[PDB]
């Protein structure tokens, strides 16, 4: 799976490592091995969350599966809000947790 | 839905406040609460458009529904470029929205 | 079909005009006319992928076909990565390439 991590927090808010320690998180939330698991953080961006531009992060999962995920979703996510509120200092309020689809994805040779 | 704006145009030329702008913008186009509207704006990125490397913006507008969108999202693409155009300085031209989908997705509690 | 590559090397290393000779490079490899090929680079980022924060880039390539397209995807792929591995100094290894659905896409008139 793909987690992209958009936020307004400036860069020098946003936790050095904070890529890596997600990743763990991750692999261990989703039950994944680590080399499975990709994580990309954009921080200093200008957003809106819930109409409100108060300090906050998106987080994007991306993964090829759909089939039977709504329930394990909803269990990731509640995870994945504790684990960012605690590093970004932010409430869960003012998290956002999408899931999207992927057709297919290669790694290099 | 969710917006997340590309640019290449440097962060000095992005309108301050764009993202709320924006997000005012969308929920009045969309016919959606503002409490559901969600923008992310990255400027100072490396991009072609069309083929070219002028400035230029793309918008992504992601949602969960799909079925019976089309002509909707043609009207909505439509002011989404009279708004954009004025507030970057960007010709019709220069910006290209596309829609994509979602499965799902949560705010903390 | 929309090109965004995420890389955690610094600006400083991503090379001028990278995002021009990628939107050729994808016209070429894609077969398609240079005005339909869309690039967008964004350095800079915290990231880590297949499990490790060594310098790395995501490429995602969106588009609106999906029927037919394992073959080609991997073929484009494996030109791609001989590109990126080139221009960005880095393993094939350390690039992934996920393919992403759009429902439709405008430019603006």
Redesign the interface.
Known sequence: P?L?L?TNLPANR?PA????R??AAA?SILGK???????????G???????S?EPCA?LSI?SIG?VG??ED??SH?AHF?EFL?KELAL???????????????????
């Open positions: 793909f992209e958009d946003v490592g904070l890529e890596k997600l990743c692999a091995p680590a080399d499975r698991v990709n994580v990309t953080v954009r921080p961006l200008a957003m809106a969350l819930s109409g531009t998106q991306s759909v995920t709504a979703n909803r996510s809000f509120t409430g869960q309020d003012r998290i956002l947790i999408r899931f999207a689809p992927l057709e297919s994805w290669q790694i290099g040779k």
